[PDB]
Amino acid sequence: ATIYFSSPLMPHNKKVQAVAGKRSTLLGVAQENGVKIPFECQDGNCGSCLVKITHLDGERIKGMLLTDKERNVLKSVGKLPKSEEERAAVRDLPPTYRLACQTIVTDEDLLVEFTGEPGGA
Amino acid sequence: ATIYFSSPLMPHNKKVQAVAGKRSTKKGVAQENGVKIPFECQDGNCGSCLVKITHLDGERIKGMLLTDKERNVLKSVGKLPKSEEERAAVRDLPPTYRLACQTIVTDEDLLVEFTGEPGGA
Amino acid sequence: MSREEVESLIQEVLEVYPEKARKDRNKHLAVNDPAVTQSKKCIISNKKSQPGLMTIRGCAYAGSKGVVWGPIKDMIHISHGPVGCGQYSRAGRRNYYIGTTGVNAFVTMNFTSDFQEKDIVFGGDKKLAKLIDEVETLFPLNKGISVQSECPIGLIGDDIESVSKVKGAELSKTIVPVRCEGFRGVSQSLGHHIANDAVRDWVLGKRDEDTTFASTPYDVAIIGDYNIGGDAWSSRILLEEMGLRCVAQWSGDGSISEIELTPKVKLNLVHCYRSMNYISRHMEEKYGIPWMEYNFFGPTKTIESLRAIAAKFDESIQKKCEEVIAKYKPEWEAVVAKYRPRLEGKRVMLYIGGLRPRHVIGAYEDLGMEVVGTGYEFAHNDDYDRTMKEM
Amino acid sequence: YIGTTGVNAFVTMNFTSDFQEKDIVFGGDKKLAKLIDEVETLFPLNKGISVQSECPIGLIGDDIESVSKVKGAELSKTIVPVRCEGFRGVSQSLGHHI
Amino acid sequence: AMRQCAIYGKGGIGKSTTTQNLVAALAEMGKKVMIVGCDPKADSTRLILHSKAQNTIMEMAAEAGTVEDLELEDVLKAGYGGVKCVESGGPEPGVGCAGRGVITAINFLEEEGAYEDDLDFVFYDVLGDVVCGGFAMPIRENKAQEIYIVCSGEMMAMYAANNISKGIVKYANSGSVRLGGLICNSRNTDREDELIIALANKLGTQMIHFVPRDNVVQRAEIRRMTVIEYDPKAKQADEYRALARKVVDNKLLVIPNPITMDELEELLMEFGIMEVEDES
Amino acid sequence: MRQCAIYGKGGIGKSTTTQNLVAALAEMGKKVMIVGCDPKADSTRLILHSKAQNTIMEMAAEAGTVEDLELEDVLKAGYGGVKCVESGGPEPGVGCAGRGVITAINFLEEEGAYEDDLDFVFYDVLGDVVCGGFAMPIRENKAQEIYIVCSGEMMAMYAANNISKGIVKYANSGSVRLGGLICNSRNTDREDELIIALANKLGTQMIHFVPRDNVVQRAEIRRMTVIEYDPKAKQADEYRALARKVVDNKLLVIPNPITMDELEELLMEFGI
Amino acid sequence: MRQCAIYGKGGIGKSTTTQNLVAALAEMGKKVMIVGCDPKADSTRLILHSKAQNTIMEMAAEAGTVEDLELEDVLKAGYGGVKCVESGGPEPGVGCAGRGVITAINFLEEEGAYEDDLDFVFYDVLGDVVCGGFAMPIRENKAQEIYIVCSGEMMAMYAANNISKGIVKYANSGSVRLGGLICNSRNTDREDELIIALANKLGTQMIHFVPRDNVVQRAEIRRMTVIEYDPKAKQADEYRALARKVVDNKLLVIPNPITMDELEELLMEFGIME
Amino acid sequence: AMRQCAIYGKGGIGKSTTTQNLVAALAEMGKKVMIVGCDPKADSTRLILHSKAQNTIMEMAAEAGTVEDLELEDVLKAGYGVKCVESGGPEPGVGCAGRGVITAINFLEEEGAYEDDLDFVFYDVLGDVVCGGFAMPIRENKAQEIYIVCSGEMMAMYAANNISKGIVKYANSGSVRLGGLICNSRNTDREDELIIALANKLGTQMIHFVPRDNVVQRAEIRRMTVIEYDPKAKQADEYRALARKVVDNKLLVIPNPITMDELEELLMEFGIMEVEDESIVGK
């Protein structure tokens, strides 16, 4: 899996290789590579690790499970439209915005954008 | 070279493999793979093929030549800021917005975004 | 009848639960109104099971290895992890196949890594490569390997994708890694999705640059029929008598080459929407192959589906379809005449995980029986959209 | 430089592909792969190869990156492809950047 | 068989009224046709559905998550014997390209498969004032095989007709887009029938039926219906039918010869519309 | 220096009204510059007495690029000392039709043609669509005052509503305001009160009413503006009243859009 | 069904002014509801009389998630007409502090607590910074009318300027407009005409000028509004006057932001700052 | 050699004045100090540079296009011998108000301003709320010693309790500790004792008590610090006294935050809040 990290705080976009499906999440890959996504909780409720994820290989999008905890936090931050909620519930397709501490790496190419601000502006 | 095409008109982002440095430009790569970037001239003077380029491997950014023809067209559609014009003149680094019919593929990973509209909105 | 009675029954049944369990389970019980087109406001599905309530659901490994990948006969499927998962699913599903087991077919066999403590502590990637090497000498006639991962594989952080790539490049073999860990997903449905993604990403696009296959305007592919007791063979004989050529069968009695020949085929006939709608949508978007849902449960649904399928071809196929219907009419008329008087008026309750409760309702109604209850362990809201009209 | 020219130092020597009309028309990358094998045969003490591309290489269409990757891993030696075609850039300045 | 058509012209000359009346005539002869409204104001389906300004794809895609989630039945309605109607709509004024809705709607129709086999004609009503952008996309992407330009005796409508013919010849090599003819809508100005005939001869194309003005058109519009249905026995009803028969029987699809601005001025003085001009 | 822009649908008298506007303004001794932002290049013919002023876009393509272009070859003075600029568009189907406005406005700032103690700058802008370089004066805060020239017709009133929607979108990011509704007559009954009804719906006062006559067309053959043709004419003073009402306009109000039925009810209740 | 928001710097009596305002509107046959968007949940204590109303954020975490939350457990009518909701906020340093407002406002629409019997809806929103969920009323068009509670002190006038800047940014997107200024008085000289000077330059109007009193101090111990404690109090009539002008206020304007010097020059002339 | 410091507190209590005067006092002892304004108000370098207002990082980044092109020399202004920077903030309503702090600290580290050519580095951080940006210096281990300006006000102590909650939250992954508490005179009789008790409840010390002096306004109109305006004044002596005990500070403790009830009972103890009873609630 190839992950491209992008942020205005970063002078250059960073390209990393990651093992898919690890118990350690996207937060693991970011922390091992010095990508400074703000992590401010250990229970997955603060929403400060909000990132925008783009599947660069659109043919290779993997079905996943959006847990009830991540879904509720995305609503509390506001980064979950009603159509994306229905898409996840019916088609098991990931939404545009994810929580990095709760995101499992899949076998594809990803673009991860964050602003350095916690979820909720 | 790996190129990821992205557009609201495209249902999925398309990933292609391209040969760097070909005389046929990114316009060539797009047309072989059926990517519908609007091409409405053969002299490179319209702005119809305007695209946004993101260098995903920020370390592997290649120095290039911003041709005076492309520079003037990018200014005629209001897509070349003064800071990026100075960066191209002094550091030979590509600007964010490019003309696909005038863009030479380099040996890196690129994300190419277009709206389906000609340059100049 | 007795809609208010049904509502009161639901309410008095829900009283034993604690507040959380009661509140969640209230969303999952409904009284059918056939006039509704959108099930989700009426009923909720595809949610996590309440802990400690004795659910009937399985895991993603069951939905991937046991459902989609297992029926493929000339491939070897490795249950990567401890021994239990492979042992309990061995030959527990009747997907019929034609072959010599252990030589060129391996459906009823259990290949596993048999993880021990040192495998958990240090990893099983080297063990996986050694296992792949051992499989090739032991079984030289296998035509591909799939690695269905169990819970510890994702829980300890193994890289089965890179091992699959390296070993496949080395041995010129198709090695498909499936990350179908049981804790992923709430039921077998995500196992279906993951298996379909693996098929799309490692198998489907292999005979893309070749054109040696001689196609025909009447080429169809059966999708989502797993030959449970020979169902797919009866469906196949019915389709071939109608004048079509069946190139692929997903995945009962299925071969890897039949899967690879599915892009060439003109039409996709999808018997189960839940398990194989993903690959059908992918094929429609990529190769331009249209797909349709059919039903071969009972004479009424069978005739309706046969006519609908024949409507997609020229008039010779329609004439052959009428010939087939006329030929088979007296047989099921005699069956109905013999058995309907014994079964008339009986009430039946159903509970099967996806598609099949709705799928068999017509067959029951063909014998004078009526379905008081229909239920799904893992169906999504589109399946309920489809089943509300039929109840 | 301090070296033995032709054995372990190669500064004053000219290694070239010598493109002809058939190489201009029919590919050109098969000659490059064959050339790298001959360099290994006749100059075994070299510690790396760089491919400095001239004007026709980018104009006919050639993938010197793949040849560098395929032959580099095969022979376990660094092959550096340089896209320094003369028409790129307005002077020697872009040659430094490339 | 899948005869795709487009109607171009200046804003406010009567493209929508001519298109809907033409389409109503075609259905009367048992022709299954579809109207795609490519005008930004999206009123080219009022007189077929009779309801109101039809909901556009831009509005439906915005209220929903995206275009692929939107339903084909939601935007493509059936009226007047089932002639299918769709409206492209447009973006907010001052934002993006005013023709972006056209690019969005045509892509949605293709992806869904709304171009079903049993359709005979597809008509696009597109504002011709500017050629560029999504308004040139049907020409550029070979979406419309034949083009009919509504034109009047006014200087602007004549100038816009020359601009559209310039677009066709630019894309003539890359596609089958050709000029079908010109439709003269009457403002009751003197010596305009021959003026449009002269322009068509200068352009190298024929001229489709000339449509005299009348107040019966407004009578059917205030009730939100086509003139042919409101009165089938009126002369305008037969005139709209006559325009439709010539459209079906049309076979002269030529590559036009755009003329110079000074030629337009010279040809305007010879009919008395423009007073003769002296530099001194 | 006050920067103004004349917006409106194509063919309602947008050019001739603007030419006679600044012809009267220069009669007061003011220094006014005219920038033609219409792909049709007749926006300055009646103040220069020319067949067709060479557009900046035509000159750049002929002479290499816009860098080689000289200010003298694009800025021509006319009657009254008015500075005249014409920016054409590209050919149909070749890119955005509005690139000419972006190139010209940027060119004029770079050469510093604004700072030369100019009083009024007028942009004659296509108003059929509000997008690309045609919306550029509103987008980039180029023209603070905006006047819409409209008539008692659906398309003319629909165009006025669309420009007002554009003003609202960019109101927060710069001082671009709707100034008034210039109304020209096509000789239709109850047109003065109809457009006034539209204006007070917006909340922006109408500037002046311009009736139709043949005096402007006799001037058109001359290629000389009505004011300079015959200063004693009825309409010659009428543009004087329109010019005087423009220089002395102190109220600018953000517009509020009007829906389709609301505009349809306005047109219907007038008996049309 | 007019929804308003109270914006201002913390410590300027905004929560009390909103509560006495609400108590002033309850008597005159109006059913209103208060939504506490301030992180500290002291904005409904005078109505409910409760020690500390349980916030939506508090009870959502204990009950698992916000889906397992009932409206009758979050919405308490301590006074029969008045409805009180406390949004709550996260602990300091844990995510965005305004995200409690987003959860509560979304929750109330979901359960339909805005139905068929509300005349006024009031939001008591933190105004020190306008971002995240605190700017959510203005950004989402939740509160059409905005009243700023300011003071003679410079930081309060600076806070009023920032809110007006945020209203301008979302003027085109939403109907939200500045409805007026509320001046809460500390015992300093030249205050009412100072804020009138601020309002006159903003293009908006002053609504009222509430002076400091000691009747409010007696009410604090009661955990009650001044209106319910002593309806004959001079402050209690003052709050009726402020309430009556709120209902009968008609002009709603798009504000004009004021620069640093221009705000500063207003302070120097009045002598508030040297 | 570098002692990274931050000053927190509620808006409008005197963070900038006290910080600038203490920093100006430090320069007298030969100390090289850098002031980083982490407040969107952006006036924490006014009295050092004698300027109208320092241009913020957000202003030059927007006017130049991006933060890459920003010269360090344009960003860093030297007045009184002490370097000054202002983070600024985004437009009110969009983004996170603390975004300027995140951008400024990131740019300073990349450009080399934070290198150890300075004895002290100070952050003037708004503490009316603890969120991203304003809590970023605590989270990212960029300010080891935190000093809280607090008055005898209910809101001021509430903010002080909130900032201490932020410190303990990150006390196990970094060395961020609580240096002390600064009391600024709100002209309250019991306030000096009130904050002494608060520091004891929090487990920290009152580093000083600053009395409300009208000589500060006379220096503020001049855009100048109190110490340079009137070195022989006693206000400059208190600022000097605060400076010495800041350097001599060694008690960097992890605080013990108190609850809302314990804050209220502490208010009633010193007479600012009256004694409440449960039987006088309904009347």
Ligand SMILES: Nc1ncnc2c1ncn2[C@@H]1O[C@H](COP(=O)(O)OP(=O)(O)O)[C@@H](O)[C@H]1O
């Ligand atoms: N054949 C006709 N006879 C008389 N009036 C017409 C005719 N066609 C259109 N009109 C009038 O012209 C006006 C504008 O026509 P419309 O079709 O809206 O122009 P567009 O081409 O811009 O859609 C309408 O109000 C209509 O009443």
Ligand SMILES: Nc1ncnc2c1ncn2[C@@H]1O[C@H](COP(=O)(O)OP(=O)(O)O)[C@@H](O)[C@H]1O
């Ligand atoms: N005040 C007027 N009175 C009579 N006719 C006018 C008047 N103004 C313009 N016209 C006519 O209307 C037409 C409008 O065209 P013009 O103003 O040149 O370009 P535009 O399309 O930009 O408005 C002209 O041909 C002119 O003859």
Ligand SMILES: Nc1ncnc2c1ncn2[C@@H]1O[C@H](COP(=O)(O)OP(=O)(O)O)[C@@H](O)[C@H]1O
């Ligand atoms: N109209 C008033 N007259 C006198 N004192 C008031 C008035 N309004 C508020 N106060 C006092 O000001 C303080 C601020 O109250 P509160 O609203 O809780 O703070 P905030 O404005 O930060 O919410 C309260 O202790 C209250 O006693």
Ligand SMILES: Nc1ncnc2c1ncn2[C@@H]1O[C@H](COP(=O)(O)OP(=O)(O)O)[C@@H](O)[C@H]1O
């Ligand atoms: N030591 C002091 N004595 C008297 N007044 C002071 C003192 N320090 C600050 N002030 C006053 O307090 C006001 C606000 O202080 P300031 O430093 O701006 O607060 P902030 O902490 O928000 O920066 C200023 O107008 C100033 O005059």
Ligand code: ICS
């Ligand atoms: S695959 Fe699926 S539970 Fe579609 S996991 Fe299950 S042999 Fe059922 S209702 Mo066993 S989605 Fe097949 C099924 Fe249906 S094993 Fe069989 S009967 S038609």
Ligand code: CLF
């Ligand atoms: S949910 Fe699914 S079936 Fe369960 S383990 Fe997980 S992949 Fe497997 Fe196999 S070995 Fe035994 S039964 Fe489990 S406990 Fe460890």
Ligand code: SF4
């Ligand atoms: S291309 Fe044409 S329609 Fe699109 S923005 Fe430009 S001028 Fe407008």
Ligand code: SF4
């Ligand atoms: S947006 Fe405002 S409330 Fe949210 S984290 Fe940033 S500063 Fe805190």
Ligand code: FES
């Ligand atoms: S780190 Fe808090 S939600 Fe992810």
Ligand code: FES
């Ligand atoms: S197609 Fe015209 S510039 Fe590229």
Ligand SMILES: [Mg+2]
């Ligand atoms: Mg129309």
Ligand SMILES: [Mg+2]
């Ligand atoms: Mg004109």
Ligand SMILES: [Mg+2]
């Ligand atoms: Mg409060």
Ligand SMILES: [Mg+2]
């Ligand atoms: Mg400050």
